């Protein structure tokens, strides 16, 4: 697999650039500085780590390294905590949009910068505690050979338990949040359509501006698309592991397929800046400013 490596490199460079661009935008332009965008910045950073770290670890583990059980389990599962943090932020954002759009009168005092701080900190902690189950002593170790004495080679499939990837990951810490996220979002959308359809039958300004509503709802859809693509990303991999696990002594997945879900899920962190540029005028204009500036500088 030559192409594969030059690939995971192309990824790292992309993800790093695009997300550094998002964070530089948010720092640079005051309009982007706000709770929603602190969670968005969390997403950016967690997707930068994958660029600088998770891909090199994706590239060592292919070549079958050998080391201490736990120090091996790190490089084995790291992108785990990243992915988890990505979910936590996505959900924080869905909820923030939910307060904003469903209960706009209490959003002012309810959602604050410092509280954003706290929820983010916490979410990172928990992204770790959950992120690597191995590190806490939960053990697939102790059951190549002559690799080493005090060193047991660490490769995902065997040194990574599939009784978790398909249970404490796919079933618990991914599908559930993703799902009540789909819920919160559909609730926002249906409700907003209801009250718009209502504002129509009663000439404005009945309660709040229709234009405003439609605008923040369009923005919510742009934000929910990010979730949709996240799902479209880790879903294939979790399907693979999913049915490969429920029939452990049944069949397994190829090289030429199985080596996708890794690439793909690794692609999940590349697209965000592009989705922003496409769906959101403030980012697009800022990226445009940063690039149109610091290029010809």
């Amino acid at each position, epitope marked *: 697999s030559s192409v594969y490596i030059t690939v995971e490199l192309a990824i790292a460079v992309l993800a790093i650039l695009g997300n550094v661009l998002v964070c530089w935008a948010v720092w640079l*332009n*005051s*309009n*982007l*500085q*706000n709770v*929603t*965008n602190y969670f968005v910045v969390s997403l950016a950073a967690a997707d930068i780590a994958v660029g600088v770290l998770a891909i090199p670890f994706a590239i060592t583990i292919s070549t079958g390294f050998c080391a201490a059980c736990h120090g091996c389990l790190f490089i084995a599962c790291f992108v785990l905590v990243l992915t988890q943090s990505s979910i936590f932020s996505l959900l924080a954002i869905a909820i923030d*949009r939910y307060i*904003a759009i469903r209960i*706009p*009168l*209490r959003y*002012n*005092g309810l959602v604050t910068g410092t509280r954003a701080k706290g929820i983010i900190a916490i979410c990172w902690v928990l992204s770790f505690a959950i992120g690597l189950t191995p590190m806490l002593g939960w053990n697939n170790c102790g059951q190549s050979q002559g690799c080493g004495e005090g060193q047991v080679a660490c490769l995902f499939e065997d040194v990574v338990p599939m009784n978790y990837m398909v249970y404490f990951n796919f079933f618990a810490c991914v599908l559930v949040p993703l799902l009540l996220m789909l819920g919160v979002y559909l609730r926002i959308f249906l409700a907003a359509r209801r009250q718009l359809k209502q504002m129509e039958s009663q000439p*404005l*300004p009945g309660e709040r*501006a*229709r*234009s*405003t509503l439609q*605008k*923040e709802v*369009h*923005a919510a859809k*742009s934000l929910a698309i990010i979730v949709g693509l996240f799902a479209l990303c880790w879903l294939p991999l979790h399907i693979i592991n999913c049915f490969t696990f429920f029939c452990p002594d049944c069949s397994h997945a190829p090289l030429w397929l199985m080596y996708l879900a890794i690439v793909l899920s690794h692609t999940n962190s590349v697209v965000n800046p592009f989705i*922003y540029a496409y*769906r*959101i*005028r*403030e*980012f697009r*204009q*800022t990226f445009r*400013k940063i690039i149109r500036s610091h290029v010809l500088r």
Partner: antibody
Amino acid sequence: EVQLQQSGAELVKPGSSVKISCKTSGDSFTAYNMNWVKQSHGKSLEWIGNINPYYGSTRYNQKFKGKATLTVDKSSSTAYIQLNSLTSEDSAVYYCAREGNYYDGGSVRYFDYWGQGTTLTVSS
Amino acid sequence: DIVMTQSPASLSASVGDTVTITCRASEFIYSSLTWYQQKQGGSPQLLVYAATNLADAVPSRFSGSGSGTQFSLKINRLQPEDFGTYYCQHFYGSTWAFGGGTKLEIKR
């Protein structure tokens, strides 16, 4: 149906202070920042500052720092601006406006509702 | 602090023709710019927000546009109800400021 009803015209000697009020009816007062604008000679507008009704927290334009003082009585849904050490140059019409807020990916801001305005005349 | 500069200061025009007002910012405010309409003896009314966005019930013949440092409001087939003074305001930053206004007068 939202309405910002400002206090009536004010005529005072230079050296004195004044408190103009804006009562809000038809929505939640604590949900939006209240702003004050000064219009001079029927033309030029200037942003004086704004106040968060919930916390009473304020941001002033530098030019009016120390001249204006913003305050809120949430009980009555009423916001006040008070002007101190009045001179003729303070003679103008003062508006309270209400700030709207939403997220388009940026923070979107506007003054959607304005008061009828209040005339202040400062002369000896 | 960021400074708005609006032109022309006054413009006379006839019902039915097209008019354009310009706001120019001393810095980069991106899209955060508001247009207000004031009728004689009235209070400024919200017209455009986010530089491109028509307020509720404002007629489609109104259009906002521009970005960064440069903005324009345009009225298409002028109606008699459209004469008055227009103002720009930037919402960028912690401290805000207005254009000097454009007075739109009837040509006879």
